[PDB]
Amino acid sequence: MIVISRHVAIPDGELEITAIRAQGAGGQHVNKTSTAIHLRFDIRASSLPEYYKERLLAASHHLISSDGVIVIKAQEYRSQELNREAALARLVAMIKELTTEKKARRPTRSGPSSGENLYFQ
């Protein structure tokens, strides 16, 4: 249900979940498998309230597109079924951060960040 608030909870069917894999042959130090999940959520296409639509769209995140889409890449487990659930945790979190401004009543703990994006042309 991705319950973000008292009147906000995605039924887990309004998202675009897709699989992501890579070949073995890499040009760097790589030998482990991929078997990851791509979680794409089109806010414009969701049942979200207008207030959240604007909050998410007006946000500035190295994982979101100005278009109105958030992208997450969960990769930890050896299957392609456990990462689909590890991705929702990240969605719920970033949504709660981008929709707010400052808070300490709920657990909140920032940290470093490792990631880039691939803009298409």
Side-chain angles (χ1 to χ4, degrees):
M1 295 301 298
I2 318 185
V3 176
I4 309 301
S5 187
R6 56 165 73 274
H7 308 299
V8 178
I10 320 178
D12 195 44
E14 296 195 84
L15 330 184
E16 179 68 271
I17 296 150
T18 337
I20 36 172
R21 47 67 159 193
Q23 74 199 294
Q28 302 73 40
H29 169 267
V30 58
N31 189 240
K32 204 184 64 53
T33 50
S34 32
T35 324
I37 288 297
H38 202 257
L39 178 167
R40 185 171 83 95
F41 174 52
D42 281 18
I43 305 103
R44 284 304 311 141
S46 72
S47 195
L48 283 175
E50 65 209 281
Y51 183 94
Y52 280 44
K53 294 213 177 174
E54 296 193 279
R55 258 66 198 185
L56 297 184
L57 276 161
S60 213
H61 206 314
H62 71 273
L63 298 180
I64 302 173
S65 186
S66 179
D67 199 278
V69 186
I70 299 150
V71 178
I72 299 176
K73 310 185 191 170
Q75 26 197 276
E76 261 164 74
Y77 303 72
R78 282 181 273 93
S79 290
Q80 213 149 35
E81 175 156 48
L82 306 183
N83 297 352
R84 31 190 191 211
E85 57 176 83
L88 82 94
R90 295 165 166 78
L91 179 59
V92 173
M94 63 195 305
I95 286 173
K96 287 173 181 180
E97 283 168 42
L98 303 152
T99 48
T100 216
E101 59 302 89
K102 176 176 66 179
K103 191 64 62 270
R105 203 252 183 123
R106 290 190 289 204
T108 298
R109 182 179 195 175
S110 306
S113 216
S114 304
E116 79 190 302
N117 60 90
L118 177 57
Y119 186 69
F120 291 83
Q121 294 184 103

